[PDB]
């Protein structure tokens, strides 16, 4: 999941997390 927005994680494309934008770091 995202941890900045909770997004699920299959939303992350090229770097950043698709809905709230944030940087791949913040995945967990």
């Given at each position: ?9 299959s ?18």
């Amino acid at each position: 999941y995202c941890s900045d927005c909770g997004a699920d994680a299959s939303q992350v494309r090229g770097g950043y997390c698709t809905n709230c934008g944030a940087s791949a770091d913040r995945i967990r």
